[PDB]
Symmetry: C4
Subunit: 90 residues, 4 copies
């Protein structure tokens, strides 16, 4: 469980490092600093306006942005539930 929470933090920071670099210049309100990114990625992880709100307007500049977001969502959303189930089991 502690190992799962460790993996998620490592993935979460690395993803926010990558997102800052990739879309920060073109989309500063969402990926401007590392902070803005960690906030946006948590939001995208919770799925609130992930597509119409974030990915779709982002893809209008970077057409392959989905190669980062869809796997991010697939990974984090799986891990978060898996971690929460693990807490409940323990």
């Amino acid at each position: 469980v502690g190992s799962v929470a460790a993996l998620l933090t490592v993935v979460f920071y690395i993803a926010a490092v990558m997102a800052t670099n990739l879309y920060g210049a073109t989309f500063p309100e969402w990926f401007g600093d590392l902070s803005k990114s960690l906030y946006t990625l948590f939001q995208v992880m919770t799925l609130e306006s992930w597509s119409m709100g974030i990915v779709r307007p982002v893809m209008n500049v970077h057409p392959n942005a989905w190669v980062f977001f869809i796997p991010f969502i697939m990974l984090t959303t799986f891990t978060v539930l898996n971690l929460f189930i693990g807490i409940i089991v323990d």
Copy 2:
């Protein structure tokens, strides 16, 4: 589990083939090519703006569009969770 992931991919591609044909001409931004569709259907699967954002404006042109989306949502959303639970069970 691998069989569940196989079913989902087959369903996902067939649904995106169908959606492209059905609503692609009337709604090109969302169902224009097969690619646009696979992206939209994953989004509809995660439920982000599925109705107000997609189904409702789609239904304004095709009034029975709900016959495709509601079962799609019921099937995929069930399968995804069922697959993820299956991964967790096979891990323990």
Copy 3:
């Protein structure tokens, strides 16, 4: 499981009968006929724009509309997961 699916259908139709009567005249696009309602209630059940999209504009006319929606959401969302878990267990 079949009993759970039966309860949900009964609740779902009764809620759509009630919603049609309550907000159909004032909000026809969402609760006009019984059909429009069954569609809106499934959407509200999935949570897509339940508040900002439906409840909030509805409450601007009917200020207590939350007494119907919040319990509806609490009941249906519990039952749906409970049913899906039941299918998986069986």
Copy 4:
């Protein structure tokens, strides 16, 4: 289970007391009275427009508003599922 439901109500009321005080003057439609807050926090708990709809416009006035909402979401969303699983377990 009853203890979990008790914790959630205590947390839910305290959070809505805090939110009313913090953002009520600047955002009255959402955190004006204690009632408006309990409604908004349930909505934020279900995640419907939590960020683009609530937190993001709130953060434009209070830049650290995320210190209240993100932990609120992490706590309540965990507890709600944990309670619902607990009901299901106690039923079997």
